[PDB]
């Protein structure tokens, strides 16, 4: 019985690989070979945010493209006004070990989590004038590595117990569980329509999940190490992953296969963060060699380097209007580039 | 330039003051990462994520026990790692050595010193005296090893020699292992951790001042 099922699974994987091969006539490099190159891009540090006294792990932009939130080892979740570099809020965290933070699309809530296996959601708009914790989602049996808001009441989290979860903040219990990863899930990216999302794990695998039914639709492989970062294309028909093998990869949902690989012989260090520009032409990739790189997502050519951090770059995000890029690092400084 | 902007800036400065106060308060604590494995007795070495705080000589130590592949990079700035090994069980000794080698050669722990705690030495002495199980059965090198009861001392020194052989290889002196032999009823582990942390901080200060 077990041998028959294993042989059937091998046959199914061979069929999937053959189907993917049959639907690969050209390549993204060949099609965009006659396109006009982006050229040289030189962003400069417009703002430098100081006030964190330890390594910064996560950073999320608000939907107004002006407020942002960052989380550090000092037990601090700081909400900054990026235009004037004014600390709008400073939230003390119950657990000093936090690896992720999120900003609600409405701007009324923030979220954080880490080695405590809890997702703490803090309400920012209270009559008392202080930021209080609104909810504490529990149920994951591993550390939380990412969390993203869908509404003011629904949040998707990825944990180190090889599972993802869609919660209900009002009730405080999981409404959907996403299983199928064998290693720890390190990142997740919500689709622009918020009907699907993608999760990358330590098994060098990315999975596309449908939020409604709650099952994996497509599985993407090709990395040779743990996937640390993942981000959706602006139109929601593709996504990009960064891994510890010093490579970035672009996968297409409709083609169900890899399109482009962004790597260089000089780079031998893993990617900690990844993001897309508003147009999707630029892929921002943060590395642990103390600097970030900009890739021409259609030509796989490095269009510029964001340097100015003296330690490992941990988080990297782009505003919804595409004005600026915020990059955090382990030197406790997060910078804004334009 | 605007009154509301000025008030917001004043609020930001107050937040900055509070953050610096909390950071100064938090700089006076030394954080230890407690590692090891089950049956090693790591929980009783000192009398989500588990935390413990103990004070000695007006110095506060924070020991964190998680439960070591991905989250351990979060502990790249701790003062020391307390590794606990159960030396009574020879079956798992090679597993413990492999785990210690993995911890020592980790890229995010290349500057962290390890305070090795060879736990349950009384059980090791009882097993050696009984003679039912022989170390040479699992480690063939014990046959030709001689100590610098004599048999218990020889076995203990052989185990410590194996761990120090793992440590000193590919160490370069940037972090030092501090082996210790401990029993369940021992109560001087806090003092040993205090002395080892003092040595670690002293070496850090000497390296900072461009001294030895």
């Amino acid at each position, epitope marked *: 019985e077990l041998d028959q099922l294993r042989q059937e699974a091998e046959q199914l994987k061979n069929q999937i690989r053959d189907a993917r091969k049959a639907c690969a006539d050209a390549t993204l490099s060949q099609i965009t070979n006659n396109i006009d190159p982006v050229g040289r891009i030189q962003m400069r540090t417009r703002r430098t945010l100081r006030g964190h006294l330890a390594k910064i792990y996560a950073m999320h932009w608000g939907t107004d493209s*002006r*407020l942002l939130v960052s989380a550090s080892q000092d037990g601090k979740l700081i909400i900054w*006004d990026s235009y*004037t570099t*004014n600390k*709008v*809020h400073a939230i003390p965290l119950r657990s000093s070990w936090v690896m992720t933070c999120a900003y609600a699309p409405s*701007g009324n809530y923030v979220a954080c989590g880490g080695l405590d296996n809890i997702c703490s959601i803090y309400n920012l*708009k209270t*009559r*008392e*004038g*202080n930021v209080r914790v609104s909810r504490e989602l529990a149920g994951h049996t591993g550390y939380l590595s990412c969390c993203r808001f869908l509404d003011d009441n629904q949040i998707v989290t990825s944990s180190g117990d090889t599972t993802c979860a869609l919660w209900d903040i009002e009730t405080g219990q999981q409404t959907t569980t996403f299983t199928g990863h064998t290693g720890d899930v390190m990142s997740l990216s919500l689709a622009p329509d918020t009907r699907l999302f993608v999760s990358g794990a330590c098994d060098a695998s990315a999975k596309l999940w449908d939020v409604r039914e709650g099952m994996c639709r497509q599985t993407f492989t090709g990395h040779e190490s743990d996937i640390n970062a993942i981000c959706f294309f602006p139109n929601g028909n593709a996504f990009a992953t960064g891994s510890d093998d010093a490579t970035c990869r672009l996968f297409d949902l409709r083609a169900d296969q890899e399109l482009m690989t962004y790597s260089h012989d000089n780079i031998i260090c893993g990617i900690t963060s990844v993001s897309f520009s508003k147009s999707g032409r630029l892929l921002l990739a943060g590395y642990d060699d103390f600097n970030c790189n900009v890739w021409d997502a259609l030509k796989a050519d490095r269009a510029g380097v964001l340097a100015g951090h003296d330690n490992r770059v941990s988080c990297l995000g782009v505003t919804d209007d595409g004005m600026a890029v915020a990059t955090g690092s382990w030197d406790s400084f997060l910078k804004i580039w334009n | *330039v*605007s*009154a*509301e*902007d*000025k*008030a*917001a800036a*004043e*609020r930001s400065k*107050m937040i900055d003051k509070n953050l610096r106060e909390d950071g100064e308060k938090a700089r006076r604590t030394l954080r230890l990462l407690l590692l090891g494995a089950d049956n090693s007795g790591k929980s009783t070495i000192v009398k989500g994520i588990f935390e413990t705080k103990f004070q000695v000589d007006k110095v506060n130590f924070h020991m964190f026990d998680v439960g070591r592949r991905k989250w351990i990079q979060c502990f790249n700035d701790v003062t020391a790692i307390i590794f606990v090994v159960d030396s009574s069980d020879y079956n798992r000794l090679q597993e413990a050595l492999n785990d210690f080698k993995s911890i020592w050669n980790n890229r995010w722990l290349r500057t962290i010193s390890v305070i090795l705690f060879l736990n349950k030495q009384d059980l090791l002495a009882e097993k050696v005296l009984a003679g039912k199980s022989k170390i040479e059965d699992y480690f063939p090198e014990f046959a030709r090893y001689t100590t610098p009861d004599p048999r218990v001392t020889r076995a203990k020194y052989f185990i410590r020699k194996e761990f120090v052989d793992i440590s000193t290889a590919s160490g370069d002196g940037r972090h030092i292992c501090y082996p210790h032999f401990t029993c369940a009823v021992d109560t001087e582990n806090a003092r040993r951790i205090f002395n080892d942390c003092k040595d670690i901080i002293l070496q850090m200060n000497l390296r900072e001042y461009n001294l030895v």
Partner: single-chain antibody, 232 residues
Framework: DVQLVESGGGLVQPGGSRKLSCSAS????????MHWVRQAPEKGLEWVAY????????YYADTVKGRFTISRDDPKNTLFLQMTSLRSEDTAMYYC??????????????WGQGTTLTVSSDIVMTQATSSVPVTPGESVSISCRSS???????????LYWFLQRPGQSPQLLIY???NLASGVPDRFSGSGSGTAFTLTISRLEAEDVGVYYC?????????FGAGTKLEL
């Protein structure tokens, strides 16, 4: 839950001294800037004084500067206004108003009750209308004018609208000329440009009668309007 009670007041001889107290409860009093605002027995609202969060900044109106001293005791959650040499023009009703200042905040959101006191250049805000007779269910508009443009270089138009119902303390309706205060029905809307603003209310109902004030927060001193009185 949020409560600002006031103590003191009463009959004071001219030239005397009096200490008004404002006790806060139900909110983080240490993080809120505080204002004292007085209303004459038959006139509009007059801004008296302001103390920042942590007592790092203090402002007074030129009418009371030198004679009034504002202070706060954070551990006791108390606000004090010490007044000396009280003239006969200082008889009013005093309110302590909380206001927290950060990006997107709503200053003057909560006003305390009133404490009575009977003693025996600046930007001018103009409310041309002094009384508008209206009927329930009919949309009306209150106009206000500014001598100087309240629009700032940062894009914010620091204009605030307040409603004082008969026998009740003022409450914030609209802050920064467009944003709607929390708890205020969507029947209130605010529009206008520099030096000319309007507050439009559609489907007027009961409990909306009373005085409407336009205040500027561009620069100290803070000045109110005359007050447009909507009556049935």
């Amino acid at each position: 839950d949020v409560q600002l009670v006031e103590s003191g007041g009463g009959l004071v001889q001219p030239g005397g001294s009096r200490k008004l107290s404002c006790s806060a409860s139900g909110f983080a009093f240490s993080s809120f800037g505080m204002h004292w605002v007085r209303q004459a027995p038959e006139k509009g609202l007059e801004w008296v004084a302001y103390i920042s969060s942590g007592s790092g900044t203090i402002y007074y109106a030129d009418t009371v500067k030198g004679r009034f001293t504002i202070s706060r005791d954070d551990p006791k959650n108390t606000l004090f206004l010490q007044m000396t040499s009280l003239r006969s023009e200082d008889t009013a009703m005093y309110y302590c108003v909380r206001s927290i200042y950060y990006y997107g905040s709503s200053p003057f959101d909560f006003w305390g009750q009133g404490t009575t006191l009977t003693v025996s250049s600046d930007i001018v805000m103009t409310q041309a209308t002094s009384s508008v007779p209206v009927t329930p269910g009919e949309s009306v508009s209150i106009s206000c004018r500014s001598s100087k443009s309240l629009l700032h270089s940062n894009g914010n138009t620091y204009l605030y609208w307040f409603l004082q119902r008969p026998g009740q303390s003022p409450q914030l309706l609209i802050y920064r000329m467009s944003n709607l205060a929390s708890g205020v029905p969507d029947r209130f809307s605010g529009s206008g440009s520099g030096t000319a603003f309007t507050l439009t209310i559609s489907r007027l109902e009961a409990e909306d009668v009373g005085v409407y004030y336009c205040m500027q927060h561009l620069e100290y001193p803070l000045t109110f309007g005359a007050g447009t009185k909507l009556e049935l």
